[PDB]
Design a protein around this ligand. Structure first.
Ligand code: ZN
Ligand code: ZN
Lengths: 708, 135, 729
């Protein structure tokens, strides 16, 4: 089954292609409506694969150097293996002198396509965690924040190095365990510093970055004694917050102390930066922070210069191999639009909320440090991703959390998409859910090898190798075999990645439509000029619907959202795996009522019954809706009566299923309990339903059966 | 929405206590001493003067005037609440000795309370007349 | 007394055995009994020349020397609801005015007649006391009385750490925290510095003090708005903990560079709002940031006379502090050249002072350790005045043209004194701008307007009255030799900075020659009036002092410091330093002041400064004002060794001997009573050290024998021979 194939391959190799059968001719390659692309999860978890403490074994043809894989033709007699990428024949390294047929190296069994190696030769560098904290916020929020930080400190590895930087009007770089005093270096938040400058003004581990085991007690006390920015805030003014400079100093500090080694710069902000570089809004309360509307009518004088400042910091950090996290909680906007690149370019996180003093933030924050079956963090640092393809395959680029190493070669395409012009990318921070989109081009069995070198949370350097192969289309059945290998879900997401990438770097809908229509005409079924005749196989029938929801989503229709919310939504969409991505675009909906157990139902107004309870899973929100009738039976009180122990199983069935997923998901989703009449019902109402899908479909058919 | 606070005996305008911090004071300090000099038993016991970008706020209790200067923007409502806090404290502490002293600023030490009260107002977290007139 | 003439070549033993007493102006009995105490205000010529021509003939400088804020025993304080001043020149009604219409008084300074306000008028305190203090009315203050503010700035570089000075200073502060002048408004703060500037936040809410470090040397700023200058009363405990911690925070420091200039700028910014006293402790040449100074090679006995600042940074900074009522006291405890000629400016123009401790070291220099100890003690406890100004007025006809001392002269001669301390001296030079043919008496009045440590605006006034004479002989008869020497020293320091050391030394010698010559032309050997019999001796002393000596091995900062002292000290101490009192003390007895109820107090005779007066058979005490050295002869008596030193023989007299022991002997009681009396005559407890053996290599006791000859300077006799050759050339 084509479905079993798609499933088993994503499970084993953490990969999903828009097409599982590729064009064997130039006349087809160029006429591909949806590009051959893959959604790749370099660190996907699976059934405990045995880590290979090896010397991976590389091909001996200078240019190639691919890793020995299951696609390689071996010869246990001649102690030789022929590379599958360049046909170069190799001699087996000494440590393999005794490998036999009835006992061969794991990297050759088709089961271990996608395998991990550990490279042990040089002492491991400790992890580094630098807390960068805003102190311009209400006491309840600050106290809550201080507690979350102290907690995270109790989870760090003994050897990890930690540093603390606090800010408000001035920026303070604390020197921990300085004894009998507690000193820091204060800088004006008014002007930026390079790193050379910083290095000079300030002076393994430094005075500013010490091992947790030696410094933890002192830092806990310091974190506990932190107080509000001392500078008063006059009437009608926002406090002066130097977020831009605080971040440049954090980046600069690590750049001149530990460049090129895993590190985490965690910034906690409680309001917009109000004193550039990086300024997002003035200090007059009477003037609101920019809205999308304000941006479109050129009434946001800070956006561009502010965006420029953070983009530079992002690239400085990403270049030095450091990760930047932004935890932003405030009642008003915080400037995530201008700072997005830091967490987007580096694989850092973006957490948004209303206050640090909520369960939402506290739980999301502690999820950050979730550990595995060995007591180790589920994070990887300084990841280098290199892709090797058959001479017939080229790479247009990638879309997701990464930066280009701008390394050239024959695999690089002229038609670049996203971060292109390279066959190597750097991902400063990644996890088991991190997902990149790789767009390919054809210029049987084509092969692609993904090699990911990263620093494990334990300190070990690791190399993840996933080698995959897909059949070349048979010449006497090209489009027929190709069509059968379509992965509509994967393709819908890959196309959505491109569209969102173009919008966040400016009509994109028109491009989306032209491609939708083209796909309908090439793989559909119909009689010219007869809309009613149009049909799609089981392989393509859901694509139109996914497209409908995507173009109406908050990912493309930004107004009705604050610029910060929009940036948050996209940030998470550009890193997520297939399952979660689909949910973001088209929320799953479950119905609950006495008449049968919970069931999935169409995202339509027709599913909103009065005697039923609905659960909507937006990746960002889990919402429970109580229909008018059940709202009454519930306002009435029948729930308590011992007579209605049934009305209880009902009222809590959705609450039960919510909890489960309301925990596995990293950014903990916001939970909402509303009903017919409630104001929060609006969330379900706007996700439900040109106009409706029926009208959208008719138009698509009217254009599918007409002129090409 | 900043500072300058002066407390003085109405009769002669004798200064009793005050507080100021710059890092001009010169001009507005004269105007304040001008007011005190003009004030007498027939003066309004609660008033607000407008001096351009600035605004004076004062109250008279037991022959003691409590004046304050600040940017016109500063909430008039808070300026008087500020004056009331000073009054009750001052009258309670020295209210009965005021009519006997003769040296300027004989209660300079009241300097402390003034400033520890001033900060609780300059941190967000009656009659009107152009002062130029009265003078 | 006597109107006699002395032949300096035949006397040679003219220094009197008892302390020299200031001249008594030739004034009517009633007027003189009301005159100002000479220790507070005196003139170089008690008989003022009627004309500039007469003044120029005498060839003697006309000027005033004052110690206006001196600690007094009894001070009249007038709280007058109104202050009586002349409607013309604003002079304070004083004892020397002239009451006529008994309801109208004539001003002794501008002659205008004033109306005595309805508030025996000549019986009022203002007319019976030459020295008096008035309470200042509301109009004598530009702002509410400022509270006392003490900011301590400490060098903590490697060298400073090595000297160990911080420990004693912090210890002296802790002990005297309750003695610092001020009421509940007192504020205190701290800053340390090396290549960076360190502020200290102090909050009761926090577990310990915070060190806020500004590393941006080219653009200093105040890191926090509150808690740097904290209320001492409220935060006593927090300040005490800090003083106990500081001396231990920089033990293992490697900082060799000192950014003094930037630290002073930050200290300034911190104090700018209120004003106050900044106490800076520096141990080396500043080399980082603005105000950095270049190294210099120390001279040697060889180099001739070939002083001034290397930059104006500190002068400009001192002027800024002055406008904000900030005074800067400099404590330099350097072992190597630190360019004091440039650093000193910070104190000169802000009315602060400089304290110097050459080669200070907690272990190596037990003498400088105790000196600093006792000097800090005085410094932290003496009275203080804030945001003050001083004006000096003199009768119409007389004009002040030059001011000497630590302050900044504003327009229409206003002496700006950010701080006014009781140990500072000032001097003024005047001239007769209009012949005094009219009057027969002239007055001088200094008014010191300041804010006390209790927040009260005060005005201290001193008035001096002197007679006017028209003959050369009368000018000489009233000459005050000590006062003249003091004003000449001040004039010579300016000349050194203006021309050169050579030109300064020459003008000193010419003032003596020119004056005796003028005398001679109006009367074989060297003849001089009685009043000037000591003039050549004191000038020679001045020429051999550390400020003006030539052929010696004195180091650069030493000379500058001695010049700073000439400019900032009161006449009395300038004389003790220039011409130390020498007494024989191994045979004291009862010709003393055994009047002090239960104490006797020996009064040994003052000896002239010559090794010809010493003796290997006795012990000699030298009182240099700031220190008391006790030289012991090699062949001293056994009684003195055991009964006074508490030793059995010369050989066992401890090398550095920081003071005498108090033994149960009548001999010990006598010498200790004598010394106690000497140090009771002043406020700065002078340290004593017998270390002066005949081989301790600290016999700098000899450098004070200004009468003997040296390889690079004349003896007293040679100097006289030289003057005589010039007098009758
Ligand atoms: Zn190969
Ligand atoms: Zn007059």
């Amino acid at each position: 089954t084509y479905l079993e194939f798609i499933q088993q391959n994503e499970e084993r190799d953490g990969v999903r292609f828009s097409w599982n059968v590729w064009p064997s001719s130039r006349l087809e390659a160029t006429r591909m409506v949806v590009p051959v692309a893959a959604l790749f999860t370099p660190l996907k978890e699976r059934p405990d694969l045995p880590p290979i403490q090896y010397e991976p074994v590389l091909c001996s043809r200078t240019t190639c150097r691919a890793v020995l894989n299951p696609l390689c033709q071996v010869d246990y007699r001649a102690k030789l293996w022929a590379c599958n990428f360049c046909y170069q024949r190799n001699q087996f390294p000494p440590s393999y002198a005794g490998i036999s047929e009835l006992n061969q190296p794991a990297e050759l069994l088709p089961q271990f396509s996608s395998i991990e190696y550990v490279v042990l030769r040089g002492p491991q560098m400790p992890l580094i965690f630098l807390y960068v904290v805003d102190t311009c916020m209400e006491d309840e929020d600050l106290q809550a924040l201080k507690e979350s930080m102290q907690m995270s400190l109790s989870l760090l590895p003994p050897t990890a190095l930690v540093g603390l930087i606090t800010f408000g009007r001035m920026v303070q770089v604390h020197e921990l365990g300085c004894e009998g005093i507690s000193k820091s270096y204060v800088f004006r938040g008014t002007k930026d510093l390079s790193a050379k400058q910083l290095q000079e003004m300030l002076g393994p581990s430094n005075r500013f970055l010490q091992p947790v085991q030696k410094i933890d007690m002192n830092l806990t006390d310091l974190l506990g004694e932190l107080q509000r920015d001392p500078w008063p805030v006059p009437q009608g003014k926002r406090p002066l917050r130097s977020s831009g400079v605080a971040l440049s100093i954090a980046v600069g500090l690590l750049e001149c102390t530990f460049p090129n080694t895993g590190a985490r710069i965690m910034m906690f902000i409680g309001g917009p930066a109000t004193q550039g570089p990086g300024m997002v809004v003035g200090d007059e309360l009477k003037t609101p922070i920019r809205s999308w509307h304000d941006i479109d009518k050129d009434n946001a004088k800070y956006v561009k210069k502010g965006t420029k400042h953070f983009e530079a910091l992002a690239n400085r950090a990403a270049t030095t191999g450091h990760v930047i996290d932004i935890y932003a909680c405030a009642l008003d906007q915080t400037g995530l639009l201008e700072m997005k690149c830091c967490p987007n370019l580096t694989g850092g996180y973006m957490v948004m909320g209303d206050s640090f003093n909520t369960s939402l933030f506290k739980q999301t924050f502690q999820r950050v440090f979730t550990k595995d079956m060995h007591g180790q963090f589920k994070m990887g640092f300084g990841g280098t991703l290199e892709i090797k393809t058959s001479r017939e395959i080229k790479i247009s680029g990638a879309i997701g959390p990464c930066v280009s190493l701008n390394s050239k070669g024959p695999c690089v395409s002229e038609n670049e998409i996203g971060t292109g012009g390279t066959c190597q990318w750097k991902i400063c921070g990644l996890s088991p859910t991190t997902t990149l989109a790789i767009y390919f081009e054809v210029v049987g069995r084509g092969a692609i090898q993904f090699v990911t070198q990263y620093q494990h949370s334990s300190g070990q350097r690791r190399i993840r190798v996933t080698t995959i192969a897909r059949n070349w289309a048979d010449a006497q059945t090209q489009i027929q075999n190709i069509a059968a290998s379509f992965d509509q879900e994967a393709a819908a997401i890959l196309m959505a990645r491109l569209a969102i990438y173009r919008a966040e770097t400016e009509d994109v809908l028109r491009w989306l439509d032209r491609q939708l229509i083209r796909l309908c005409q090439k793989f559909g079924e119909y009689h010219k000029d007869d809309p009613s005749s149009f049909r799609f196989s089981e392989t393509f029938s859901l694509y139109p619907q996914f497209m409908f929801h995507l173009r109406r989503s908050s990912f493309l229709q930004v107004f009705n959202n604050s610029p910060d919310e929009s940036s948050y939504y996209r940030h998470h969409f550009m890193r997520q795996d297939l399952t979660q991505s689909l949910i973001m675009i088209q929320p799953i909906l479950y119905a609950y009522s006495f008449s049968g157990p919970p069931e999935p139902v169409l995202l339509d107004s027709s599913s909103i019954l009065a005697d039923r309870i609905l659960l909507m899973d937006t990746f960002f929100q889990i919402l429970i809706y109580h229909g008018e009738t059940i709202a009454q039976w519930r306002k009435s009180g029948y729930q308590d009566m011992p007579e209605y122990e049934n009305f209880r199983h009902l009222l809590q069935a959705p609450v039960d299923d919510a909890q489960e997923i309301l925990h596995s998901r990293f950014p903990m989703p916001r939970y909402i309990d509303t009903e017919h009449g409630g104001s929060q019902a609006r969330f379900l109402l706007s996700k439900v339903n040109d106009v409706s899908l029926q009208v959208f479909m008719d138009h698509l058919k009217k254009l599918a059966v007409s002129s090409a | 929405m900043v500072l300058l606070t002066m407390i003085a005996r109405v009769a002669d305008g004798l200064p009793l206590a005050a507080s100021m911090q710059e890092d001009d004071l010169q001009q507005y300090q004269s105007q304040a001493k001008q007011l005190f000099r003009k004030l007498n038993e027939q003066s309004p016991t609660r008033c607000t003067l407008e001096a351009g970008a600035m605004t004076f706020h004062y109250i008279i209790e037991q022959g003691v005037c409590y004046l304050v200067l600040c940017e016109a923007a500063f909430p008039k409502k808070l300026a008087f609440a500020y004056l009331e806090d000073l009054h009750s404290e001052f009258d309670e502490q020295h209210g009965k000795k005021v009519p006997t002293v003769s040296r300027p600023y004989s209660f300079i030490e009241f300097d402390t309370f003034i400033q520890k009260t001033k900060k609780l107002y300059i941190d967000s977290r009656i009659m009107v007349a152009n002062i130029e007139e009265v003078l | 007394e006597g109107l006699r003439v002395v032949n300096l070549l035949q006397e040679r033993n003219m220094l009197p055995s008892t302390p020299l007493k200031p001249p008594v102006p030739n004034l009517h009995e009633d007027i003189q009994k009301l005159n100002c105490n000479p220790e507070l205000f005196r003139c170089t010529l008690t008989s003022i020349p009627q004309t500039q021509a007469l003044l120029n003939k005498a060839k003697l400088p006309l000027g005033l020397l004052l110690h206006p804020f001196k600690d007094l025993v009894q001070l009249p304080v007038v709280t007058s609801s109104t202050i009586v001043r002349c409607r013309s020149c604003r002079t304070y009604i004083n004892p020397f005015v002239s009451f006529l219409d008994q309801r109208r008084w004539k001003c002794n300074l501008c002659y205008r007649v004033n109306d005595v306000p309805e508030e025996e008028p000549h019986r009022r305190p203002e007319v019976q006391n030459a020295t008096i203090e008035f309470m200042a009315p509301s109009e004598y203050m530009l702002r509410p009385p400022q509270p006392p503010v003490y900011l301590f700035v400490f060098d903590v570089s490697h060298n400073a750490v090595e000297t160990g000075y911080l420990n004693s200073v912090c210890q002296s502060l802790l002990d005297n925290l309750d003695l610092l002048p001020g009421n509940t408004r007192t504020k205190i703060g701290f800053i340390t510095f090396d290549s960076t500037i360190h502020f200290y936040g102090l909050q009761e809410s926090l577990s310990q003090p915070q060190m806020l470090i500004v590393s941006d040397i080219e653009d200093v700023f105040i890191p926090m708005p509150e808690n740097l200058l904290v209320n001492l009363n409220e935060s006593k405990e927090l300040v005490q903990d800090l003083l106990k911690t500081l001396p231990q925070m920089f033990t293992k420091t490697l900082e060799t560079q000192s950014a003094l200039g930037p630290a002073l700028q930050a200290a300034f910014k911190l104090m700018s709002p209120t004003g106050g006293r900044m106490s800076v402790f520096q141990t080396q040449l500043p080399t980082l940031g603005v105000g950095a100074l270049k190294p210099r090679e120390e001279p040697n006995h060889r180099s001739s006379a070939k002083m001034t600042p290397s930059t104006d940074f500190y002068k400009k900074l001192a002027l800024d502090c002055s406008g904000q009522q900030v005074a800067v006291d400099l404590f330099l405890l350097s072992g190597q050249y630190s360019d004091l000629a440039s650093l000193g400016c910070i104190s000169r123009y802000s009315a602060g002072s400089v304290y110097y401790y050459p080669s200070y070291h907690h272990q190596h220099n037990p003498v400088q350790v105790q000196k600093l100890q006792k000097e800090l003690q005085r410094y932290l406890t003496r009275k203080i005045g804030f945001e003050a100004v001083m004006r000096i007025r003199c009768t119409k006809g007389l004009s002040i043209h030059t001011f000497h001392g630590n302050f900044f002269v504003r327009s229409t001669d206003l002496l700006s004194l950010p701080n006014v301390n009781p140990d500072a001296g000032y001097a003024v030079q005047m001239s007769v701008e209009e012949s005094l043919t009219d009057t027969q008496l002239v007055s001088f009045q200094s008014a010191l307007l300041y804010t006390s440590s209790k927040g009260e605006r005060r005005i201290r006034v001193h008035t001096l009255c002197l007679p006017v004479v028209s003959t050369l002989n009368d000018v000489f008869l009233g000459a005050d030799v000590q006062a003249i020497s003091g004003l000449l020293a001040n004039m010579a320091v300016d000349r050194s900075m203006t021309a050169s050391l050579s030109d300064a030394r020459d003008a000193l010698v010419n003032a003596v020659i020119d004056s005796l010559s003028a005398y001679r032309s109006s009367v074989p050997g060297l003849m001089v009036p009685f009043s000037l019999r000591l003039f050549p001796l004191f000038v020679l002393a001045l020429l051999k002092q550390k400020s003006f000596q030539t052929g010696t091995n004195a180091r650069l900062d030493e000379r500058i410091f001695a010049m700073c002292q000439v400019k900032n000290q009161p006449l009395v101490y300038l004389m003790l330093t220039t011409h130390p009192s020498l007494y024989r003390v191994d045979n004291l007895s009862d010709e003393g002041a055994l009047n002090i109820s239960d104490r006797t107090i020996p009064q040994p005779p003052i000896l002239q400064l010559s090794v010809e007066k010493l003796s290997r058979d006795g012990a000699f005490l030298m009182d240099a004002g700031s220190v008391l050295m006790l030289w012991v002869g090699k062949n001293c008596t056994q009684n003195f060794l055991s009964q006074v030193l508490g030793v059995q023989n010369y050989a066992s007299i401890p090398q550095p001997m920081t003071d005498l022991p108090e033994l149960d002997t009548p001999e010990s009681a006598r010498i200790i009573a004598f010394i106690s009396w000497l140090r009771e005559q002043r406020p700065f407890f002078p340290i004593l050290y017998v270390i002066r053996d005949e081989s301790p290599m600290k016999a700098n006791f000899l450098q004070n024998m200004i009468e003997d000859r040296t390889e690079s300077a004349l003896s007293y006799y040679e100097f006289l021979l030289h003057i005589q050759q010039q007098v009758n050339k």
